Amino acid sequence: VKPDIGQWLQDVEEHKAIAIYAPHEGGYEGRYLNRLKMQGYYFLDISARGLGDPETTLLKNYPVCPAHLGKQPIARWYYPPEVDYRLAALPPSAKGLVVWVLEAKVLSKSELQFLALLPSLRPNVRVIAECGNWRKFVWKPLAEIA
Amino acid sequence: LMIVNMGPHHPSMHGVLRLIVTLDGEDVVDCEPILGYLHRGMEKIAENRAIIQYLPYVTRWDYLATMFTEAITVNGPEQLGNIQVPKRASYIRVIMLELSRIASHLLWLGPFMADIPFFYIFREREFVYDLFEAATGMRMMHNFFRIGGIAADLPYGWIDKCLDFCDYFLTEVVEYQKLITRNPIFLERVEGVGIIGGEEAINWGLSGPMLRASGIPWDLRKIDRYESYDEFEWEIQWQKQGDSLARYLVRLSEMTESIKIIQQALEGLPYRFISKKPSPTFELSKQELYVRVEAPKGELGIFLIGDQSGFPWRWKIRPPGFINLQILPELVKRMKLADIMTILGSIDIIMGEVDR
Amino acid sequence: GTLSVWLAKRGLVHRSLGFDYQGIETLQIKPEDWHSIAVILYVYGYNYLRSQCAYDVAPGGLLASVYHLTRIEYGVNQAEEVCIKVFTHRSNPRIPSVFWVWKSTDFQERESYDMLGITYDSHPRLKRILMPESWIGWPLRKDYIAPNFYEIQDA
Amino acid sequence: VYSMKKGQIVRVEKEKYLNSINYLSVGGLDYIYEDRGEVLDLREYALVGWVGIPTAPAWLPTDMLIKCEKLVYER
Amino acid sequence: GQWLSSVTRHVRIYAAYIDPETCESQMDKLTLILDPTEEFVWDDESCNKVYSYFQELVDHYEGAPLTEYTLRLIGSDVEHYIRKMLFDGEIQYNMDARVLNFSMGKPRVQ
Amino acid sequence: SIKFPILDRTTKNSVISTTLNDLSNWSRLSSLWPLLYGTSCCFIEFASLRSSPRQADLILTAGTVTMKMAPSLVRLYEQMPEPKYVIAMGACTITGGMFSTDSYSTVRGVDKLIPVDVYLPGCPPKPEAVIDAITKLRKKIAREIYKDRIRRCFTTNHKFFVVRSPH
Amino acid sequence: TGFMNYGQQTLRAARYIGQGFMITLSHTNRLPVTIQYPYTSERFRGRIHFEFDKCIACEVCVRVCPIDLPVVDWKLETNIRKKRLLNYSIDFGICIFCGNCVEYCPTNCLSMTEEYEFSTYDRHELNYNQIALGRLPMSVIDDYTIRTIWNSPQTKNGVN
Amino acid sequence: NQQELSSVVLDIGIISVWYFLVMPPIIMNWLRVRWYRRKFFEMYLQFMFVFMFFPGLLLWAPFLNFRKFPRDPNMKN
């Protein structure tokens, strides 16, 4: 049993925001990510289990704030953004898009998930690859609830 | 005389250690124990941290029984400041310390019986960690020892599970006692080693099972009147058979003695959570105070020279098993590579309090 | 103390510092007479030595390697504790080890040399028991700086 | 009640701290010789520690160290 | 034993008879293996600069008994030199390995 | 500031070759089988969840790693060099743990020693946390298509003798 | 009769192997419990729940910590005693979850939860924000793969 | 020089497709529904059965349809 149906690729090039409803039954999730990577794209990772203010983290150069262990000062520096530097992390020209692989469907407000589906359409080189709250099968419904 | 490397990944799992031996043939004759592998520099950082900040640090020493470390490092400031602990919280501390002694001896004999299996003891250990979850909430990383006693109170389910633990646990213990009488491979594969007597175990440095192995009723908390030990039932192992099976009967008798102490303390209940808490922050004094408690490996110790500040000026620990490690250079002289597994099992040591 | 005015009063320097917090007693003893003093306190009833304590008060000055010798045994339980206070300095780390008579002092004196650098004699293998053998400097003494090592920072 | 304040730069010479182990690594080198250590506590003696290096601190005599300036250095 | 080295990321002492990559047996020939994990770019001219800097550091820092503590010190300040070289942009990262953890922190907008 | 890859094409673009790559990758993501590597506070998860130190490429570092532990650790990674990586499962394999400030003989993470895929919360979590960690590693290896078997050796060396002074 | 004594030793050995085989055959009957993947009480001390507006002043999280990890920048606003708190940055790689300021907070906005699934792919991702620390983790009764965990009872034998 | 059978087709191929098709879903179903309701005698004979009955389970190994609904839930995905 192995879908081998690139309909998920058609969904990611048509809707570009699909909840990957797939269990913890091993690695049956990255095969469509591997097919997106074999198409010439570049895929990087994120997780919403500790990502707060997602539009303020993907853009607007959210602060670094290095954790001093009671020795160094605050040093409130500005780290580069998540996906703007990732668009800056495409050195050749053959890379057609940038896939943002998100792997945490829990602890993610539906409001903020809809806000993150916004920068999947804010540019045209952003693919949202969020999770789908771990169904038993492999389902890819679109961002409809968010 | 082919030099063994005695690498970091041992065929057994009892820590990382170095025991290079010439081993003329298969007889090992000369031991050079190299240590320093699991080292963290507890003394200098403890001089650089307070009591409420080195109080999360007391988990990396004897983590098979974490109640003893935080127990002695909180009993330090209690007798230092001369602040009285009420009888209820102190007796519940006695119960959980003896339960951690139970856990230390069973988590010794688990991997020791695995080397010479895991779910033969884990069917007890799941309820043991359920008792740790109902007692403090963590598995072995508890932070629940204050000056006035336990940081929290016992819930209404933990006392019922503590009442059920005796007839949940002692029956499988006595079903596990008859194996060494039945199975002769423990009468032929670990029999013999441990040839030190009492006048020599007093002579070198020894304490705990290696001192009780010779038939000496030794106990710190019986000599030093501590936590009303003469009220409870006691039977310190005066087993004088010397060898490793004598040490196994020592550990069975220590577990059964702790079972008798907890079983007499099931319905004791002589008293709040923390006595003397006006303020969250305090300091320490400057005395010459060396506090010790009956370790499961024998006289864990805390040395303290105060600063009258927020930091202790001197914080030195005397771990039981590291002083116990000194005897293997003398218990290596006429044994085999198939014997040193039994040796490093019968020392009953983990490398958390060794390097530290 | 008891033995300072009964046994060590016959021509030994049992320079007392008063009583300790609970029952112990601190008596200053010079390294010059420390092995014979150890044998004299050994043939007294005291047999059980544990927790050699190397405290580092006055950094750059006095250095001490005190004991906690007592007289516990098998049947009797007369626990008379005492601190044999031996002293040294930074300029003179020379101290005699008890490893010739009390041969279980391998790990204790090796940790004392490993964390302070107290020079020893009559010892079978004095090596750095926690640090590498190439390691210079001693961390427990309070006038020490851990040098520019990248494994000590997170970065 | 003490010698100096808390938070001044500590400059160290190899001859000025000759009681310590500053002459073993002849040459590697070190880093606390310049104005890097900061005074964190004082007693005759004063606690020291670098403003950016997170390592353990130390205790050194009030004349063996030297209050240099108020110039922290990081990045 | 026989291995006498302080081997970390991008700095490996490896004082052995290693003219190519085949290891051996052990001598005074310290073979500085750099970047085992493919973490940064490491252009050949910049690698020659870092190797010449390490040669000057081991030339000026010797004279004392060459033991493991000198190896710790020389690998440590070699890693400081690599960190201050990549912070000034002489050494970019890689993004061709399967981790790319950005081990020296992200370059800011300053 | 990064480097640039090659990224020419995918030569093995048949159905049989990508099918074999997917099946071998999913079976590679199925068969963890670690070397255990306990001997610390993270050994306690082994009883709830070989001996040849060149066999098991999918080892997770479940132990407190120190500076003296580091040469044997990088030698053991030299004994697992090409195929697979390690998983940090103790805050001391990540940041140095609770002694991240003032410990001299403890490395601040093996993230300056060895390539690490997954970072744990650290101190012994529940026994299903390692199951979720190896499941997320299986999802990571499932993303990997064995890099299309694309290979480079540096070989930096000086043949000038050092100014040595042995014992 | 030394080989007879070898035979008697093996007779006692076979009796012990048979008895221990009965013991282990009975030990293989541990069917109801079987802890595994899903496919506790309130003091789990896992993921720490944080509230931003209840967080006000006295910075004790940075003081009682064994490593002093918290980094909160603050600039005093005049005549209203407001510190203008920003960027509650907690690194869980630095964090031990040893729990001092969870119970030592004067505000007591620091509370623990039952979440422990923070195994991440990068160490710079672990620097979490104040809105990421205000998430309700999971209602573990409400999963289609998680049953009732045997908290109060033990050896229930009810799934089968 | 015997040729005692003289059957050309549909003698062992019928029995092979019978044992490879009818057996493995009922075998895997008995492995599912009797995973806990068993004596160690019953687990012993089930282990012997699954050892005897291995290579028919190759078409049923990746497919898994009726095995996760321990409630009365709704497909809220």
Ligand code: SF4
């Ligand atoms: S982070 Fe703590 S519990 Fe985990 S391995 Fe390191 S010392 Fe042990």
Ligand code: SF4
């Ligand atoms: S949360 Fe605690 S430490 Fe932080 S400002 Fe409030 S009282 Fe102070």
Ligand code: SF4
């Ligand atoms: S959670 Fe634990 S380690 Fe973290 S700041 Fe609070 S007390 Fe310190």
